[PDB]
Design an enzyme around this catalytic site. Structure first.
Site, PDB file in Angstrom:
ATOM      1  CD  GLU A 251      -3.112  -0.801   0.255  1.00 45.01           C
ATOM      2  OE1 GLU A 251      -4.036  -1.602   0.197  1.00 45.01           O
ATOM      3  OE2 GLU A 251      -3.005   0.238  -0.557  1.00 45.01           O
TER       4      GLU A 251
ATOM      5  CG  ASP B 147      -7.946   5.183  -5.323  1.00 44.81           C
ATOM      6  OD1 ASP B 147      -8.422   4.397  -4.568  1.00 44.81           O
ATOM      7  OD2 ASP B 147      -8.647   5.785  -6.251  1.00 44.81           O
TER       8      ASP B 147
ATOM      9  CG  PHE C 227      -6.210  -3.281   4.338  1.00 51.97           C
ATOM     10  CD1 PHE C 227      -5.811  -2.360   3.366  1.00 51.97           C
ATOM     11  CD2 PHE C 227      -5.891  -2.988   5.667  1.00 51.97           C
ATOM     12  CE1 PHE C 227      -5.122  -1.185   3.691  1.00 51.97           C
ATOM     13  CE2 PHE C 227      -5.202  -1.823   6.023  1.00 51.97           C
ATOM     14  CZ  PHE C 227      -4.843  -0.904   5.032  1.00 51.97           C
TER      15      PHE C 227
ATOM     16  CB  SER D  64     -11.347 -18.082  -5.068  1.00 51.58           C
ATOM     17  OG  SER D  64     -11.052 -17.749  -6.384  1.00 51.58           O
TER      18      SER D  64
END
Ligand SMILES: [Cl-]
EC number: 3.2.1.17
Length: 162
Positions: free
Chosen positions: A11, A20, A104, A117
Protein backbone atom coordinates in the site's frame (compact mmCIF):
# COMPACT_ATOMS: atom_id res chain seq x y z
CA UNK A 1 7.04 -10.92 7.57
CA UNK A 2 3.51 -10.33 8.80
CA UNK A 3 0.28 -8.71 7.62
CA UNK A 4 1.60 -5.29 8.60
CA UNK A 5 4.81 -5.51 6.68
CA UNK A 6 2.96 -7.09 3.76
CA UNK A 7 0.42 -4.35 3.46
CA UNK A 8 3.02 -1.70 4.02
CA UNK A 9 4.72 -2.99 1.03
CA UNK A 10 1.65 -3.26 -1.09
CA UNK A 11 0.00 0.00 0.00
CA UNK A 12 2.93 2.34 0.43
CA UNK A 13 2.96 5.44 2.70
CA UNK A 14 1.62 8.88 1.86
CA UNK A 15 1.29 11.74 4.27
CA UNK A 16 -0.80 13.97 2.15
CA UNK A 17 -4.24 13.32 0.66
CA UNK A 18 -4.04 11.93 -2.82
CA UNK A 19 -6.43 10.47 -5.36
CA UNK A 20 -5.96 6.72 -5.96
CA UNK A 21 -6.09 4.63 -9.13
CA UNK A 22 -9.83 5.04 -9.16
CA UNK A 23 -9.74 8.61 -8.37
CA UNK A 24 -10.67 8.39 -4.73
CA UNK A 25 -9.16 10.41 -1.93
CA UNK A 26 -6.85 8.43 0.20
CA UNK A 27 -4.11 8.88 2.69
CA UNK A 28 -1.45 7.08 4.77
CA UNK A 29 -1.10 3.35 4.24
CA UNK A 30 -3.90 2.66 1.86
CA UNK A 31 -6.56 4.52 3.96
CA UNK A 32 -9.57 5.31 1.75
CA UNK A 33 -11.02 8.61 2.85
CA UNK A 34 -13.99 8.89 0.70
CA UNK A 35 -15.53 8.21 -2.67
CA UNK A 36 -16.71 11.72 -2.80
CA UNK A 37 -15.09 13.75 -5.55
CA UNK A 38 -14.99 16.54 -3.16
CA UNK A 39 -11.66 17.31 -1.59
CA UNK A 40 -13.01 19.17 1.38
CA UNK A 41 -15.34 16.34 2.08
CA UNK A 42 -12.19 14.28 2.10
CA UNK A 43 -10.50 16.69 4.46
CA UNK A 44 -13.47 16.50 6.75
CA UNK A 45 -13.21 12.71 6.78
CA UNK A 46 -9.54 12.95 7.46
CA UNK A 47 -9.99 15.27 10.45
CA UNK A 48 -12.61 12.88 11.81
CA UNK A 49 -10.23 9.98 11.33
CA UNK A 50 -7.35 11.58 13.07
CA UNK A 51 -9.34 13.65 15.55
CA UNK A 52 -7.89 17.06 14.77
CA UNK A 53 -7.94 19.72 11.99
CA UNK A 54 -5.36 18.69 9.55
CA UNK A 55 -5.76 20.36 6.15
CA UNK A 56 -4.74 17.10 4.31
CA UNK A 57 -1.42 16.28 5.89
CA UNK A 58 -0.64 13.82 8.67
CA UNK A 59 2.37 12.50 10.41
CA UNK A 60 3.77 9.04 9.92
CA UNK A 61 2.78 8.08 13.42
CA UNK A 62 -0.75 9.18 12.63
CA UNK A 63 -0.59 7.17 9.49
CA UNK A 64 0.51 4.09 11.32
CA UNK A 65 -2.18 4.53 13.85
CA UNK A 66 -4.86 4.61 11.19
CA UNK A 67 -3.30 1.61 9.57
CA UNK A 68 -3.48 -0.50 12.71
CA UNK A 69 -7.08 0.43 13.07
CA UNK A 70 -7.64 -0.53 9.47
CA UNK A 71 -5.97 -3.91 9.88
CA UNK A 72 -8.03 -4.63 12.89
CA UNK A 73 -11.11 -3.60 11.12
CA UNK A 74 -10.33 -6.02 8.31
CA UNK A 75 -9.95 -9.04 10.51
CA UNK A 76 -12.89 -8.12 12.50
CA UNK A 77 -14.93 -8.09 9.38
CA UNK A 78 -13.78 -11.50 8.10
CA UNK A 79 -14.53 -12.97 11.54
CA UNK A 80 -17.94 -11.46 11.54
CA UNK A 81 -18.85 -12.80 8.19
CA UNK A 82 -20.62 -16.10 8.56
CA UNK A 83 -19.07 -17.54 5.55
CA UNK A 84 -15.54 -16.11 5.82
CA UNK A 85 -14.96 -16.90 9.43
CA UNK A 86 -14.73 -20.61 9.08
CA UNK A 87 -12.74 -20.13 5.92
CA UNK A 88 -10.16 -18.06 7.78
CA UNK A 89 -10.14 -20.20 10.82
CA UNK A 90 -9.22 -23.09 8.62
CA UNK A 91 -6.18 -21.43 7.10
CA UNK A 92 -2.66 -21.34 8.16
CA UNK A 93 -1.19 -17.95 9.19
CA UNK A 94 0.33 -16.90 5.88
CA UNK A 95 -2.89 -17.62 4.04
CA UNK A 96 -4.86 -15.89 6.67
CA UNK A 97 -2.61 -12.80 6.03
CA UNK A 98 -3.48 -13.06 2.34
CA UNK A 99 -7.18 -12.90 3.18
CA UNK A 100 -6.61 -9.99 5.47
CA UNK A 101 -4.75 -8.25 2.61
CA UNK A 102 -7.73 -8.78 0.29
CA UNK A 103 -10.32 -7.58 2.82
CA UNK A 104 -8.32 -4.56 3.65
CA UNK A 105 -7.98 -3.58 0.03
CA UNK A 106 -11.44 -4.28 -1.37
CA UNK A 107 -13.91 -4.63 1.44
CA UNK A 108 -16.50 -7.23 2.36
CA UNK A 109 -18.78 -6.87 -0.48
CA UNK A 110 -16.23 -7.29 -3.24
CA UNK A 111 -14.57 -9.97 -1.21
CA UNK A 112 -17.66 -12.08 -1.45
CA UNK A 113 -17.08 -12.27 -5.19
CA UNK A 114 -14.28 -14.65 -4.42
CA UNK A 115 -16.20 -17.32 -2.67
CA UNK A 116 -15.79 -19.82 -5.46
CA UNK A 117 -12.02 -19.47 -5.15
CA UNK A 118 -12.14 -19.95 -1.48
CA UNK A 119 -14.20 -23.08 -1.59
CA UNK A 120 -11.77 -24.39 -4.15
CA UNK A 121 -8.99 -23.92 -1.54
CA UNK A 122 -11.01 -25.53 1.16
CA UNK A 123 -10.98 -28.37 -1.23
CA UNK A 124 -7.24 -28.36 -1.77
CA UNK A 125 -7.82 -27.17 -5.44
CA UNK A 126 -4.98 -24.67 -4.94
CA UNK A 127 -3.85 -23.94 -8.44
CA UNK A 128 -7.36 -23.88 -9.71
CA UNK A 129 -8.34 -21.36 -7.05
CA UNK A 130 -5.27 -19.32 -7.96
CA UNK A 131 -6.03 -19.22 -11.64
CA UNK A 132 -9.60 -18.44 -10.75
CA UNK A 133 -8.65 -15.48 -8.66
CA UNK A 134 -6.76 -13.93 -11.55
CA UNK A 135 -10.02 -13.77 -13.43
CA UNK A 136 -11.23 -10.68 -11.81
CA UNK A 137 -11.54 -6.98 -11.77
CA UNK A 138 -9.05 -6.91 -8.90
CA UNK A 139 -6.33 -8.61 -10.72
CA UNK A 140 -7.08 -6.64 -13.86
CA UNK A 141 -6.73 -3.42 -12.04
CA UNK A 142 -3.62 -4.00 -9.90
CA UNK A 143 -1.99 -7.03 -11.38
CA UNK A 144 1.34 -7.01 -9.60
CA UNK A 145 -0.20 -6.57 -6.21
CA UNK A 146 -2.91 -9.19 -6.88
CA UNK A 147 -0.26 -11.55 -8.20
CA UNK A 148 1.62 -11.29 -4.89
CA UNK A 149 -1.49 -11.88 -2.85
CA UNK A 150 -2.55 -14.77 -5.03
CA UNK A 151 0.84 -16.41 -4.79
CA UNK A 152 0.77 -15.91 -1.03
CA UNK A 153 -2.73 -17.59 -0.77
CA UNK A 154 -1.74 -20.38 -3.03
CA UNK A 155 1.55 -21.25 -1.43
CA UNK A 156 1.32 -20.44 2.25
CA UNK A 157 4.75 -18.87 1.83
CA UNK A 158 6.07 -15.29 1.75
CA UNK A 159 7.99 -15.81 -1.38
CA UNK A 160 6.28 -13.13 -3.40
CA UNK A 161 7.42 -10.65 -0.81
CA UNK A 162 11.16 -11.03 -0.53
CL1 LIG B 1 -11.12 5.98 10.39
Amino acid sequence: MNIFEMLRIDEGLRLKIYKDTEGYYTIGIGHLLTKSPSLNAAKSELDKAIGRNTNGVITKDEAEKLFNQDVDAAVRGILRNAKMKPMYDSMDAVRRAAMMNMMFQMGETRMAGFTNSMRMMQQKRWDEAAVNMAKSRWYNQTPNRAKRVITTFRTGTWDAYK
